[PDB]
C-alpha cells in the first residue's frame, strides 16, 4: 500500500510530477493546467521535447512559453490535439479534465476505447473514459467532465507507470 502523497513523492523523485506552481508541495486538492499535464505525459512516457515548432495559435504560445516543447511532443505523439482544429487552440492555461487525462493515458498505453460505453463523459471521451476506468487509471465514481485533482492525476499517472512496467515495453 502506497498513499497518494507517497506516489507523488516517487513520481517527483523520478522527475515526472512537479509541485503545484509557486510551491514544491503535492497540493493534492488543487487542479492542474493542460500545459503542466503535457509535461507530465512527456516525462511519464519518456517523449522527446520538440523546440522551435508551434502547431497552436493560442495567445502567448511561442518560444517564450515553457510548455511549448512538451505540448508539441504530446501533439506529435498523438496523445493531445487541443480543443479546436479550426482555430488551432490547445488551451494550455485550461485545467485538464478526468476524461481529457483518460484519452492521453488510454492512447499512450495503447488500450482500446470501449465502443458504445454508457457513462457521463462528453460524447467524444465516452470510450476513452470507459477504457481508463476499466484499466483502473480513474475510479468509476470520478466525474469525467470535472477538472482532475492532482490526487486523481498522481493515482492515474502511477497506475499508468505500473501498467507500462508490467507490459514488457516500459
Ligand atoms: C470554445 O467554445 C466551444 O463552444 C462549442 C459550442 O458547441 C459545442 C458542440 C457544444 O458543446 O455545444 O462544443 C463547444 C466546445 O466544446 C468543446 O468541443 C471540442 C471539440 O469537439 C472538444 O474538444 C475535445 O478537446 C479535448 C482536449 O483535450 C484532449 C486530451 C486533447 O487532445 O488535447 O482531447 C481533446 C478531444 O480530442 C477533443 N478535441 C477535438 C479537436 O475534438 C472539447 O472537449 C469541448 N469542451 C467541452 C467542455 O465539452 C467549446 N466549448 C468549450 C467550453 O470548450
| CA-based nearest residue to 7, from 129, 142, 161 | 161
163, 135 in Cβ contact below 8 A?
A: yes
Question: Resolution in angstroms for this experimental structure?
Answer: 2.1
Which technique was used to obtain these atomic coordinates? Answer: X-ray
Which cell is 129 given?
473514459
Nearest C-alpha neighbor of 95 from the set 24, 39, 52, 31: 31
Cβ(132)–Cβ(106) below 8 Å:
yes
Query: Is 124 near ligand 1, meaning CB less than 6 Å away?
Result: yes
Q: Is 126 in the pocket of ligand 1 (CB under 6 A)?
A: no
**Pocket of ligand 1 contains residue 55 by CB under 6 Å:** no
| Residue of 41, 83, 94 to test ligand 1 pocket, by largest number of atoms within 8 Å of CB | 83
Residue with CA nearest ligand 1 atom 36: 83
Q: Which atom of ligand 1 is nearest to the CA of 90?
A: 33
Q: How many Cα atoms sit within 13 Å of 87 on the Cβ side? A: 8
Domain count along the chain = 1
Domain range holding 109?
1-170
101 CA → ligand 1 middle, Å: 14
R_g over Cα of the chain: 15
Amino acid at each position: 500500500a502506497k498513499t497518494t502523497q507517497e506516489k507523488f513523492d516517487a513520481l517527483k523523485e523520478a522527475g515526472v510530477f512537479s509541485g503545484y506552481p509557486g510551491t514544491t508541495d503535492a497540493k493534492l486538492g488543487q487542479d492542474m493546467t493542460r500545459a503542466e499535464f503535457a509535461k507530465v505525459l512527456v516525462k511519464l512516457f519518456g517523449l522527446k521535447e520538440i523546440h522551435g515548432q508551434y502547431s497552436y495559435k493560442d495567445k502567448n504560445y511561442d518560444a517564450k512559453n515553457w510548455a511549448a516543447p512538451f505540448i508539441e511532443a504530446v501533439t506529435a505523439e498523438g496523445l493531445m490535439q487541443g480543443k479546436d482544429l479550426t482555430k488551432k487552440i490547445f488551451d494550455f492555461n485550461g485545467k485538464i479534465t478526468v476524461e481529457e487525462a483518460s484519452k492521453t493515458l488510454v492512447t499512450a498505453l495503447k488500450l482500446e476505447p470501449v465502443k458504445d460505453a454508457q457513462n457521463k463523459a462528453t460524447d467524444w471521451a465516452k470510450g476513452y473514459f470507459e477504457a481508463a476506468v476499466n484499466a483502473g487509471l480513474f475510479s468509476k465514481d470520478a466525474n469525467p467532465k470535472a477538472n482532475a485533482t492532482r490526487a486523481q492525476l498522481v493515482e492515474a499517472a502511477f497506475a499508468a507507470d505500473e501498467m507500462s512496467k508490467g507490459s514488457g515495453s516500459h
